[PDB]
């Protein structure tokens, strides 16, 4: 029993994380087979990243100014070439601790970990949700760039998110593994707002099952609703559209609780209109969100 | 920017993780150079459970009936002894990934990474805090048992905790490495009630501390108090009494924000007496008492 925010076990990305520096600025890299793959920002001062051609500045690069340390030892780096945002160096070692793996772009609502990187040294792992705004609420100080987000399927690390930028509002953006942001924003130091932080329903919906499972049961009412019911309140609560794709991933949920997927919908609903009145569920004064229901039958069943 | 409740990197711990197999029991050991440390329970069937004793059950044990497998190879038992309520197996081979380690046992609010594991595998890795009524809130599925608690100073794993049981509450108890239950639990499946669940008053201070440095201060207000005006307020609303001890400690986040220890308690009563108003900090509607003042200094300056 309990259940827990949890991160995926972090050792196969921790042995991927090296050191990159281009003249004055260090930040993390990824070493996958011979390739380490940084923000392109590595090569700018604070002064470029108010306005940076990345193509101009990188004509000034070459091989021998990016410096790549794994550890304490150093790697020669024999090409690199930029693709959208993200600098592939060619090493000339592949990486001995190279995990099975995969690039992935993933989806609004989709949960992650994050290894949390300085100099190319991990200090902590948390697990984020893109949100529907395609921002993360992550954990970044100076030298957090490159930083990592990822899922572990048995033995295959998925590589979904490198870290690039926070935003004025102190949010994060940055891109899948080919170097594309996630959403409309850009590695410059420029005015870039997210849009509305929508609540990801589905995943509420996910962590009741999970509350109900561990036996927090006080929220679950004598009441159901239809899909265009429940979503004329979530739109006026800021939460995003349930569609029957969603009430189709709850079915397994639905299943091992027997509540019904719209039953579990009229409980949310009513917390929405009612609030908490101070209770809490699985230790949450507020609806949880980054628990997707593959999670929740995960952390539930005990996969590894 | 950004705050998330944020464990270690796994990784050194992943490496030292072992399923251990008496007849029908399987669970977790931890493998430190020539030693495996589990749950004695695991000599156990869930009959023995109810009234064991360990030394009766135990001699009926040889070293060939502990299985001890690391990956898919199996390792050699040599000897076996009981440490309180943990056992040492002996192994012919030194688990050659041995971190540097500390066994230590921690007070209660210290904080620590539990990775969740299932026969031997890594599921999940999360932080948790030594309640002040010594259990631990955990994730813990049949098979869970002999998961660890540990700090990362640098590159010294400090192991705190191997878990041994859930209650009948669905909270967590277990043992530091030499097998000396945290709090008055013993590992027999009996009537075992945790007591008073107080908040950790120190690590809510300096939870609003990562606030404030984050941006969050709409809870900062034009009072201040006393310690013993503070902890009758306290005493009130089942937070642990303040020391000097604890304001000695938040002096560094005191002095960084320029907000008295005292005004931040005062700030702090203000929240106890007049709730949230449906207003979050750091994303939460509740007071987080699970960052220790070392914690929150770590992630507000990014210790490697």
Same mark, same amino acid.
């Given at each position: 029993s309990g259940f827990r925010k949890m991160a995926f076990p972090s050792g196969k990305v921790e042995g991927c994380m090296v050191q990159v520096t281009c003249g004055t600025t260090t930040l993390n890299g990824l070493w996958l087979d011979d390739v380490v793959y940084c923000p392109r920002h590595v090569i700018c001062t604070s002064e470029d990243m108010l306005n940076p051609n990345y193509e101009d500045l990188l004509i000034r690069k070459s091989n021998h100014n990016f410096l790549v340390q794994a550890g304490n030892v150093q790697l020669r780096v024999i090409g690199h070439s930029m693709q959208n945002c993200v600098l592939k160096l060619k090493v000339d070692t592949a990486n001995p601790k190279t995990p099975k793996y995969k690039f992935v772009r993933i989806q609004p609502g989709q949960t992650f970990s994050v290894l949390a990187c300085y100099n190319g040294s991990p200090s902590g792992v948390y697990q984020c949700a893109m949100r529907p705004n395609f921002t993360i609420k992550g954990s970044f100080l100076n030298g957090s760039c490159g930083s990592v987000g990822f899922n572990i399927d048995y033995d295959c690390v998925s590589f979904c998110y490198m870290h690039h930028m926070e935003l004025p509002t102190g949010v994060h953006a940055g891109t899948d593994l080919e170097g594309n942001f996630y959403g409309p924003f850009v590695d410059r130091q420029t005015a870039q707002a997210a849009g509305t932080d929508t609540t +990801? $329903? =589905?995943?509420?919906?996910?962590?009741?099952?999970?509350?109900?499972? &561990?036996?927090?049961?006080?929220?679950? &009412?004598?009441?159901? $609703? $239809?899909?265009?019911?429940? &979503?004329? =309140?979530?739109?006026?609560?800021?939460?995003?559209p349930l569609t029957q794709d969603?009430?189709? +991933?709850?079915?397994?949920? %639905?299943? *091992?609780? #027997?509540?019904?997927?719209?039953?579990? @919908?009229?409980?949310?609903?009513?917390?929405? *209109? &009612? #609030?908490?009145?101070?209770? $809490?569920?699985? #230790? %949450?004064?507020?609806?949880?969100?980054?628990?997707?229901?593959?999670?929740?039958?995960? *952390? @539930?069943?005990?996969?590894?």
């Amino acid at each position: 029993s309990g259940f827990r925010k949890m991160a995926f076990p972090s050792g196969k990305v921790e042995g991927c994380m090296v050191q990159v520096t281009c003249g004055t600025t260090t930040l993390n890299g990824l070493w996958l087979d011979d390739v380490v793959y940084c923000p392109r920002h590595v090569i700018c001062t604070s002064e470029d990243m108010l306005n940076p051609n990345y193509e101009d500045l990188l004509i000034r690069k070459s091989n021998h100014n990016f410096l790549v340390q794994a550890g304490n030892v150093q790697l020669r780096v024999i090409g690199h070439s930029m693709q959208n945002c993200v600098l592939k160096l060619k090493v000339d070692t592949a990486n001995p601790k190279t995990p099975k793996y995969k690039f992935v772009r993933i989806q609004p609502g989709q949960t992650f970990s994050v290894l949390a990187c300085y100099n190319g040294s991990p200090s902590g792992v948390y697990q984020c949700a893109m949100r529907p705004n395609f921002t993360i609420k992550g954990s970044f100080l100076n030298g957090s760039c490159g930083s990592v987000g990822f899922n572990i399927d048995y033995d295959c690390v998925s590589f979904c998110y490198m870290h690039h930028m926070e935003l004025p509002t102190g949010v994060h953006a940055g891109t899948d593994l080919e170097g594309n942001f996630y959403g409309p924003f850009v590695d410059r130091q420029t005015a870039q707002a997210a849009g509305t932080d929508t609540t +990801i $329903t =589905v995943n509420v919906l996910a962590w009741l099952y999970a509350a109900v499972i &561990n036996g927090d049961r006080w929220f679950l &009412n004598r009441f159901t $609703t $239809t899909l265009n019911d429940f &979503n004329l =309140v979530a739109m006026k609560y800021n939460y995003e559209p349930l569609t029957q794709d969603h009430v189709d +991933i709850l079915g397994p949920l %639905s299943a *091992q609780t #027997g509540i019904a997927v719209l039953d579990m @919908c009229a409980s949310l609903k009513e917390l929405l *209109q &009612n #609030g908490m009145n101070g209770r $809490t569920i699985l #230790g %949450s004064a507020l609806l949880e969100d980054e628990f997707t229901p593959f999670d929740v039958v995960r *952390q @539930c069943s005990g996969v590894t």
